[PDB]
Amino acid sequence: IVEGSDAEIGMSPWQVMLFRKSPQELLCGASLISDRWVLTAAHCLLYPPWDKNFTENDLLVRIGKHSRTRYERNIEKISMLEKIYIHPRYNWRENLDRDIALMKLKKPVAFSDYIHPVCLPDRETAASLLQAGYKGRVTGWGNLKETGQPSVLQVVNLPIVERPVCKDSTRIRITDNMFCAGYKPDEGKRGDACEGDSGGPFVMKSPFNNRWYQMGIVSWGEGCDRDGKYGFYTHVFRLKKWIQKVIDQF
């Protein structure tokens, strides 16, 4: 997170950390959607250009954290993966289209004041909130500047941007399963996700029932918090059906 601020305790009870066993290091961000399933970006697990191809036993899932490096005894919960599912049509070759993956935990995690699942949007909710100008929130333990890292979970509120503006800001072919967010060059305010925040949740609080819904997943960007450039996120509702399939089928 660039130009954000320290999150307050229990502010993102669904924030998950993808931790690599060896070497022990932050891999990606992720989110808890139920007591047995975590959602993240597919490029966190598979991305050939960088020789990345992790499997169930290469990593751990850490839920309920605040501090980036400390083992938060009695607060955080470390879980093991039983199965990883990458969207069958994930296009890592061209534009990172369909950058999504689901992870099944070995055992259900118990909720607490720091561990709680976020909601998945439904057609009605996505349509009401997914509008240009409406702000969302991104959280992560990633880099603070493009060129080091935070001690505590960082957070930023960012406005969703009109599809047109998103297209004309890059040479990469944008698709319907993506959306971008960030402040424009002349808006005075700034901020963005960055390396390390990948797979992290972009959420919005419904003004109708007071619940938090995950609308996107930190996917890609060109640099971090660069004027004229924007962050791109996986459109969670668009892939909602593949999510339901996977879950009630396995």
């Binding site: 931790f19 066993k21 022990q24 290091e25 932050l26 036993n57 751990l60 850490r62 980036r68 490096t69 400390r70 083992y71 470390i78 093991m80």
Partner: peptide, 10 residues
């Protein structure tokens, strides 16, 4: 990163 307990390394 602070080392995490061993009974998790699986």
């Amino acid at each position: 990163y602070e080392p995490i307990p061993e009974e998790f390394a699986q």
